[PDB]
């Protein structure tokens, strides 16, 4: 979604440094408001101490700051963050791999549902759409980006993902629960009907198609699960309490105290707490990692591009089972027909990458 | 890619020490430029303090260094690195196992696509090439090493990975999305056509071949996923901010202060901060681990050898389904034909490795 | 169960802060009693020191507090918590995914058990119920929420999850062990009988149905396993000992000592230990994460909604194999019938999400 994969292809001088200059889906964009509030509160307190408080009050503030500063402990906060963000990142990738792709069903339906006639075409196209509908229905249930595009079941129909007859059949089936599973049932029934009409040769080929369907159903189930079963609220609250506890301490503790009073650790007044602000970016930004990925189907810069996926799948699916049904290129003898050990060429820039075969560690390289 | 597996086969005296003398894909090669800039900036500051600053300015610098040094904290940085590099290393190995190998399809196509005639040969060879094409297409999409070898679809054709007719059929299919999935559809269709021509006996054998194809498709999908879905930019930025924050502190904080002034912790002036430089190699090098593996399909020394894989697969694939179709060696009685409990010999050096059978922990060894 | 997934969809200003204002399944609700006891014991000790102890006793108490405070170490406690809670969270999600769903069997039974006659209907409905019964039986064995709804096998019958004849057959089978596996055997037998009556065409389709059953059986087994095999008691005790050891130290160590005596670290008397209480919420709350998820089938706010699952599954299961058996909507040509590259519309709010196809990192974006 915010792909910088190509920038970090090689480990050169500024591989990671360069990324500090990027705004989209960045730490700056996510921390902006919070940082400003921190900045403000800090310097506000700072001025009160420098310009308002009396000599006696200043002494209390200094004692208060020494107290607060002793409670700004990074080690405990770093612990809970690391473990929590790991959980979030784990679920994050699991949710991606749970986004259903038509390609596997697509390959089978395209080759195993017979007929070069309009019915055979309508059959294959309708099967794929039942798959894609099963997906779109669950996606609009878990993704705010998708839902805002399909807020009502009418949107689904008008967009061409569902026919008005299908919508009629949809409504006819009375159930208080999410009906995303309906198209998945239709598919299996239609696949069976197709086999009985002789459009699907064996049962071996039919079960094979039914299996790939079930897999897609399991995919939709995972998406439902991660959406339903949030990371326990108490856990989420714990890490924010820990993080905020730290910054609360810093607000007062990291204040620049009187240099004259010669407090151990506070010999220099720089007015601006450079390293404290750098710690804020670190920890608040670290929390923002979880904050953004805790729901990867939202509208964040780094949240998944689910709508493009829907579009791509629609186009590719139908194309593979329609225009590509039993439609192959002209079989030719390959360029290496009489060559048992082919030696495909290399461009000038990639010749260094033509390596001798790795036989194994145990063998002498001679 | 940089295999030292054999060097570290045994845990001897210099098993790991020896590796410190290696340059290829080393910590030295990856840190070179960064280290020099660090070295320079350090000693530059050092001379300014020793030769330029006035007695009063020197006192400020010393107070500034004590301030900076107190913010050089390894524990928080070590935390975020460990967790982040773990994520990178995890994806790194996942991407490797997502590189498709023909061998499984190769075995089935070679034995289950009948015919010792030119057509049977052309059939098997074309099937494998559709697999290898499905792979090469996705690899040149995710690997810069491969793309620079196949920058254009013409390169693919001229290299003998795709026929001009196939390229024609390729273009004929209108789609705005990556067409790496096309050959995978062709394969399934060609496999079905082959079965209808009687070249594939049952549907059981056909579905078995279709399954291994789908698996390969899933492999290609994973590669696409890891390439598309980068590690969240904010996360990457966080760890570089933390790391750089540390080295910023060290640049000033680790300066050798006046020994005469007798600052606690700064009693000795060595001019060269040995342990600070050793910390740089540690942490900057630790970050370089992620820096290099964040995209294992690039052109780093330790990035995958994808072009060799392509070459190896091409050669082996075709050879197994062509020259090896229904072609076996002469069946003989094995050397242990009349021996129920064979005792295969051992070389002189390996006799110590002839062990008694491990029956289980519970049994008395008598 | 306590789903806040939609609140945290985007990473905005108060994404996580807002959650601190929630009571259901919160850190406040889980810590309430413990916190009060801590509060009490603290201030009780505090008053004894301020109002009761003599000048000489106060000096002993102050020496005792310095001793206790030196043993309030967060790093070791944070370690064991992180690792332990991770184990708990791991099992927590594993247990969820082990909750059996009918949908996969549901799809097969609905399309592959022939007959639009009362018997065919009774056959399909009875098969599904054997699945759902296999589930309900194990759930009431592991979930207190479910058991309190089905305390006796009579409740199961009267609720319509089991017929009195089935209950009779149930009792007839003499076994000292949990009979949750019984319906799973009935299913396989009934599925075979159904095939012999010609209601299930091939054995390929029958084995396919038998497989999905076995999968459900494995699901039930996992639930049994996690319920039977608790996290080792010693491990659980260790983390509570560590946590309580910390709070024991804090009770005395974190007492506000005499400011006049000028103890290093105790220059200010605030009467209320703000940061110590914040540490309590952190660590006691962190332990509460494990405390709540160690048994996700209990009656906690964040424990699974197993009874709703049972209800939903019952409704959906039967509906899909009965009202939906070979019952499809009217096949129509899709809205994109003559459109090879469909361009589904976007709402006003979601047009920004219409992206160009991601081809791969290697390709020049031009």
């Amino acid at each position, epitope marked *: 979604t915010v792909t910088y994969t190509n920038r970090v292809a090689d480990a050169r001088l500024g591989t990671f440094s360069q990324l500090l200059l990027q705004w989209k889906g960045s730490i700056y964009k996510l921390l902006y408001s919070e940082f400003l509030i921190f900045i403000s509160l800090y310097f506000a307190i700072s001025l009160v101490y420098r310009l308002i408080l009396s000599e006696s009050q200043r002494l209390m503030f200094e004692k208060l700051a020494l107290y607060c500063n002793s409670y700004a402990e990074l080690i405990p906060v770093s612990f809970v963050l690391g473990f929590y963000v790991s959980l979030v990142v784990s679920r994050w990738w699991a949710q991606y791999e749970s986004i259903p792709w038509p390609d596997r069903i697509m390959n089978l339906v395209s080759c195993n549902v017979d007929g070069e006639d309009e019915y055979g075409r309508l059959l294959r196209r309708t099967l794929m759409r039942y798959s894609n509908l099963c997906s779109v229905l669950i996606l609009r249930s878990v993704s705010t980006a998708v839902y805002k595009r399909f807020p009502s079941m009418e949107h689904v129909v008008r967009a061409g993902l569902m026919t008005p007859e299908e919508h009629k059949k949809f409504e006819s089936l009375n159930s208080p629960h999410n009906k995303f599973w309906i198209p998945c049932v239709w598919f299996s029934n239609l696949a069976v009907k197709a086999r009985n009409e002789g459009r699907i040769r064996d049962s071996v080929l039919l079960q094979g198609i039914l299996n790939e369907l079930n897999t897609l159903r399991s995919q939709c189930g995972r998406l439902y699960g991660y959406d339903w079963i949030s990371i326990p609220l108490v856990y989420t609250q714990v890490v924010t309490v820990a993080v905020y506890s730290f910054f609360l301490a810093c607000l007062i503790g990291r204040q620049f105290l009187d240099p004259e009073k010669a407090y151990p650790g506070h010999e220099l007044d720089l007015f601006v707490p450079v390293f404290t602000f750098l710690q804020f970016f670190f920890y608040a930004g670290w929390l923002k990692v979880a904050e953004q990925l805790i729901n990867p189907f939202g509208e964040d810069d780094d949240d998944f591009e689910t709508n493009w996926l829907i579009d791509r799948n629609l186009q590719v699916s139908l194309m593979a089972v329609d225009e590509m049904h039993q439609d192959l290129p002209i079989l030719e003898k390959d*360029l290496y027909w009489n060559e048992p050990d082919p*030696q495909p*060429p*290399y*461009t*000038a*820039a990639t*010749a*260094e990458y*033509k390596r001798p075969s790795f036989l194994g560690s145990t063998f002498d390289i001679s | 890619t940089v295999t030292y597996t054999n060097r570290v086969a045994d845990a001897r005296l210099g098993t790991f020490s020896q590796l410190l003398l290696q340059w290829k894909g080393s910590i030295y090669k990856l840190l070179y430029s960064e280290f020099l800039i660090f070295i320079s900036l350090y000693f530059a500051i050092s001379l300014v303090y020793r030769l330029i600053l006035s007695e009063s300015q020197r006192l400020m610098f010393e107070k500034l260094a004590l301030y900076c040094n107190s913010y050089a904290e390894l524990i928080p940085v070590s935390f975020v690195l460990g967790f982040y590099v773990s994520l990178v290393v995890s994806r790194w190995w996942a991407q490797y196992e997502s590189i498709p190998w023909p061998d499984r399809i190769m075995n089935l196509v070679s034995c289950n696509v009948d015919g010792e005639d030119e057509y049977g040969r052309l059939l098997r060879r074309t099937l494998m090439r559709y697999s290898n094409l499905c792979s090469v297409l996705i690899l040149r999409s995710v690997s810069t090493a491969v793309y*620079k070898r196949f*920058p*254009s679809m*013409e*390169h693919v054709v*001229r*290299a003998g990975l795709m026929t001009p007719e196939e390229h024609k059929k390729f273009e004929s299919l209108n789609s705005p999305h990556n067409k790496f999935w096309i050959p995978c559809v062709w394969f399934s269709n060609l496999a079905v056509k082959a079965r209808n021509e009687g070249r594939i006996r049952d549907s059981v054998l056909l579905q078995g071949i279709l399954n291994e194809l789908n698996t390969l498709r899933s492999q290609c999908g994973r590669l696409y996923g890891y390439d598309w879905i980068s590690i969240p930019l904010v996360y990457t930025q966080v760890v570089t901010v933390a790391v750089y924050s540390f080295f910023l502190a060290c640049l000033i904080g680790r300066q050798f202060l006046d020994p005469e002034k007798a600052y606690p912790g700064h009693e000795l002036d060595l001019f060269v901060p040995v342990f600070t430089f050793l910390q740089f190699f540690f942490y900057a090098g630790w970050l370089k681990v992620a820096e290099q593996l964040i995209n294992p399909f690039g052109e780093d020394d330790d990035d995958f050898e994808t072009n060799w894989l392509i070459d190896r697969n091409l050669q082996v694939s075709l050879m197994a389904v062509d020259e090896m179709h229904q072609d076996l060696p002469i069946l003989e009685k094995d050397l242990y034909w009349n021996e129920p409990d064979p005792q295969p010999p051992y070389t002189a050096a390996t006799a110590e490795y002839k062990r008694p059978s491990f029956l289980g922990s519970t049994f008395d060894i008598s | 169960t306590v789903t806040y997934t939609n609140r945290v969809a985007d990473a905005r200003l108060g994404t996580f802060s807002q959650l601190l204002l929630q009571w259901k399944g919160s850190i406040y609700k889980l810590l309430y009693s413990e916190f009060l006891i801590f509060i009490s014991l603290y201030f009780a000790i505090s008053l004894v020191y301020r109002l009761i102890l003599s000048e000489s006793q106060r000096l002993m108490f102050e020496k005792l507090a310095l001793y206790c405070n030196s043993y309030a170490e967060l790093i070791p406690v944070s370690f064991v918590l992180g690792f332990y809670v991770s184990l708990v969270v791991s099992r927590w999600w594993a247990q969820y995914e082990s909750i059996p769903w009918p949908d996969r069997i549901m799809n097969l039974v609905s399309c592959n058990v022939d007959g639009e006659d009362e018997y065919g209907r009774l056959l399909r409905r009875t098969l599904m119920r054997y699945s759902n019964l296999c589930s309900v039986l194990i759930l009431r064995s592991v979930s207190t929420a479910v058991y309190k709804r089905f305390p006796s096998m009579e409740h199961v019958v009267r609720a319509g999850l089991m017929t009195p004849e089935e209950h009779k057959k149930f009792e007839s089978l003499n076994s000292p062990h949990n009979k949750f596996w019984i319906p799973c055997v009935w299913f396989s037998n009934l599925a075979v009988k159904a095939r012999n009556e010609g209601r299930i065409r091939d054995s390929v389709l029958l084995q396919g149905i038998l497989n999905e059953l076995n999968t459900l059986r494995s699901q039930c087994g996992r639930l049994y396993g996690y319920d039977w095999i608790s996290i080792p008691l010693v491990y659980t005790q260790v983390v509570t000992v560590a946590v309580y050891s910390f709070f024991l130290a804090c009770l005395i160590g974190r007492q506000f000592l005499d400011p006049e005596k000028a103890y290093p670290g105790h220059e200010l008397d605030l009467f209320v230990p703000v940061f110590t209480f914040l540490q309590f919420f952190f660590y006691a709350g962190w332990l509460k994460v494990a405390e709540q998820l160690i048994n996700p089938f209990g009656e906690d706010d964040d424990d699974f909604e197993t009874n709703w699952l049972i209800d939903r599954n019952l409704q959906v299961s039967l509906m899909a194999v009965d009202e939906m058996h070979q019952d499809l909507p009217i096949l129509e040509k899709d809205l994109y019938w003559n459109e090879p590259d469909p361009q589904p519309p976007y709402t006003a709010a979601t047009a920004e999400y219409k992206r160009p196809s991601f081809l791969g990192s290697t390709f*020049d974006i*031009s």
Partner: antibody, heavy 109, light 106 residues
Framework: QVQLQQSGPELVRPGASVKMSCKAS????????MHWVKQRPGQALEWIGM????????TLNQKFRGKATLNVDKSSNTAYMQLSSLTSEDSAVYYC?????????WGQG | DIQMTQSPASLSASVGETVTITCRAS??????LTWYQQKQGKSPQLLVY???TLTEGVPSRFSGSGSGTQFSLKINSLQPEDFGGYFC?????????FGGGTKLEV
């Protein structure tokens, strides 16, 4: 049809500098590496260097390290080469060629 | 660098004849060799690539062979057009050095 149109002939004094062009057409500019070859009477063809239109990555011949410079303009689909510190030996015919495991299309010169 | 040694420096033959030019590599370049035809004043043209494969326009009378360090171009049944310059180039690495050339005269 693939066509590489280079700039016209040039005449300069020693020590000066020159910059010749090469406009490609009939194919995707950025998908093929552009090479430059030097042709002197009696001598063999010399490879000057190559350029990746996409990222403007240059790879020169050690023999031309300080003499030649390469860059492109993706917008105008043209490649450029600059020769500095020109001498009498820098007089020759200069070609630009397209690579596809071989040089299948050259400029007029 | 890889050195390309071409021979003969110049060949003289009459229409109908069959000649054979030879390029030999300093080190193994596998099948990575190309053959170009260049007529005086004009820019070179691709004849054979990958040591054996003929390009589009090239007539069947042209053929390439070899592998490793020994390659050769063979023009059987010469024509009036086939008279001019002929050189080779390896395509294994950078820099892709060229051969000395061969002048085919009548």
């Amino acid at each position: 049809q693939v066509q590489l149109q280079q700039s016209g002939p040039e005449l300069v004094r020693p020590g000066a500098s020159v910059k010749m062009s090469c406009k490609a057409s009939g194919y995707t500019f950025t998908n093929y590496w552009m090479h430059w070859v030097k042709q002197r009477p009696g001598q063999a063809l010399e490879w000057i260097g190559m350029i990746d239109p996409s990222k403007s990555e240059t790879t020169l011949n050690q023999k031309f390290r300080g003499k030649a410079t390469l860059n492109v303009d993706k917008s105008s689909n043209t490649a450029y080469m600059q020769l500095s510190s020109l001498t009498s030996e820098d007089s020759a015919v200069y070609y630009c060629a397209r690579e596809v495991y071989y040089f299948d299309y050259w400029g007029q010169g | 660098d890889i050195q390309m040694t071409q021979s003969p420096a110049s060949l003289s033959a009459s229409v109908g004849e069959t000649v054979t030019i030879t390029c030999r590599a300093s080190e193994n370049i596998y099948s990575y060799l190309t053959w170009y035809q260049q007529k005086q004043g004009k820019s070179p043209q691709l004849l054979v690539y990958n040591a054996k494969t003929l390009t589009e326009g090239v007539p069947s009378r042209f053929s390439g062979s070899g592998s490793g360090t020994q390659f050769s171009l063979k023009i059987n049944s010469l024509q009036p057009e086939d008279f001019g310059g002929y050189f080779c180039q390896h395509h294994y690495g950078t820099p892709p050095t060229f051969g000395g050339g061969t002048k085919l005269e009548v």
